[PDB]
Amino acid sequence: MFPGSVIRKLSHSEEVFAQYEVFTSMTIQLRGVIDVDALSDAFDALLETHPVLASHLEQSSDGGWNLVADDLLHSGICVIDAELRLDQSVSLLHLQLILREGGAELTLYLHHCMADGHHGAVLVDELFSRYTDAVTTGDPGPITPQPTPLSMEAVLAQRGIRKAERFMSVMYAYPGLPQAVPVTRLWLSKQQTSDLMAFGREHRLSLNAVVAAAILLTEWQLRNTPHVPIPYVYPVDLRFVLAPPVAPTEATNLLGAASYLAEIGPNTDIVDLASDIVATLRADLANGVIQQSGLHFGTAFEGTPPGLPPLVFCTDATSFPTMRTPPGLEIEDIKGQFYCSISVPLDLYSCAVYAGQLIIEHHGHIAEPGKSLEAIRSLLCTVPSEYG
Numbered sequence: 001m002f003p004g005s006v007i008r009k010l011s012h013s014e015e016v017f018a019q020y021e022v023f024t025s026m027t028i029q030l031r032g033v034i035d036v037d038a039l040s041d042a043f044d045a046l047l048e049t050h051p052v053l054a055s056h057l058e059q060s061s062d063g064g065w066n067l068v069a070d071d072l073l074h075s076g077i078c079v080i081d082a083e084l085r086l087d088q089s090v091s092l093l094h095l096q097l098i099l100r101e102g103g104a105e106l107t108l109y110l111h112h113c114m115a116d117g118h119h120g121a122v123l124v125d126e127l128f129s130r131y132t133d134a135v136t137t138g139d140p141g142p143i144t145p146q147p148t149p150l151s152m153e154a155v156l157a158q159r160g161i162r163k164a165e166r167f168m169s170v171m172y173a174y175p176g177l178p179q180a181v182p183v184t185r186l187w188l189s190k191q192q193t194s195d196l197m198a199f200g201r202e203h204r205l206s207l208n209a210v211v212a213a214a215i216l217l218t219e220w221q222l223r224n225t226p227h228v229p230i231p232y233v234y235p236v237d238l239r240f241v242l243a244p245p246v247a248p249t250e251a252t253n254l255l256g257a258a259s260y261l262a263e264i265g266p267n268t269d270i271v272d273l274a275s276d277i278v279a280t281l282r283a284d285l286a287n288g289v290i291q292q293s294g295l296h297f298g299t300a301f302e303g304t305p306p307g308l309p310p311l312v313f314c315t316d317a318t319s320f321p322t323m324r325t326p327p328g329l330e331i332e333d334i335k336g337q338f339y340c341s342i343s344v345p346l347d348l349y350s351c352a353v354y355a356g357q358l359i360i361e362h363h364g365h366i367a368e369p370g371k372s373l374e375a376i377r378s379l380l381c382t383v384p385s386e387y388g
Helices: 015-019 036-049 117-136 152-158 190-200 207-223 270-287 297-302 369-382
Strands: 006-009 023-031 055-059 065-069 078-080 093-098 105-111 183-186 230-237 255-262 312-315 330-338 348-354 357-363
Touching: 015 297, 023 117, 036 093, 036 117, 105 117, 183 330, 183 369, 190 207, 190 357, 190 369, 207 230, 207 270, 207 312, 207 348, 207 357, 207 369, 230 270, 230 297, 255 270, 255 297, 297 312, 330 348, 357 369
Parallel strands: 078 093, 230 312, 312 348
Antiparallel strands: 006 065, 023 105, 023 330, 055 065, 093 105, 183 357, 230 255, 348 357
């Protein structure tokens, strides 16, 4: 509504991101001439299509958080040639362009209470779609403003759905200024990827499916604790699962959480593990466990709960291709990073295939960041060659 007025209170599912001042960034390394004027038009046009982004959070007397509306007259790009303070109470979106040699660095900051990976990616893609239309044409494209995207509990309420479920047995058995989260990243040669892929569909599996196995195996090899299970959790976009489908910007965060207690022994086989995981998902979907369980992937930012072995979180956020860029500009790299407030127990893995190259990542304040990532690294290059 009018700036200063309350848009809506955040849903319990969204509060995680407010409680840990979680912000998500997306940086595109560029090469070429950035027509800043046109870029600013695209950013302004985008904001008019998603007027919610023009707000901030205010913790209500009732312990909850209010999404309060702001004005769009203040939100503009920020060109440069840390130097920045992300603050929930102030803004939830920041477009930072840093000019460089051949190309500059485009970086979008988005508070996670307004979008999960999918919703955000769609925005990032919209931005570049408008820039291309802004440079190609004098117009960044038509603007049709959308209403306040729904919270997950809102989406379920519209449907029947009124209102962990596997880690109960292993139970007790066996936000000031935000700071960047350390992020380690390892790549794979165009070839090594193709090798892992070929090995993939040569077992009725997928990169993501295998990758998780590799991650889960390694976790055991370094846990220095045998026979102790490894609780696994990953995101599931309920947008293609639920009743009338939900569109990416239609909801804030609609990523369900799929649990899976991996029990790796010294003989456990990659495909064996990979396939069991994939199958369990299907069983849960078929039983409506994922749809009806209030579990969301935001829980990832809450680390491991009491009385439970270290949870392994991994997001299959492989994406960002087919992204429009006018003639003369080209994307050289796309890195994602979080900026939750210090002390966030964020232990998370992630992967994606960029330019036909698999990219492994480990996020969070952890000792020997590239330790497991490397163990997992060589493991994804071994399995495809020597399996028989």
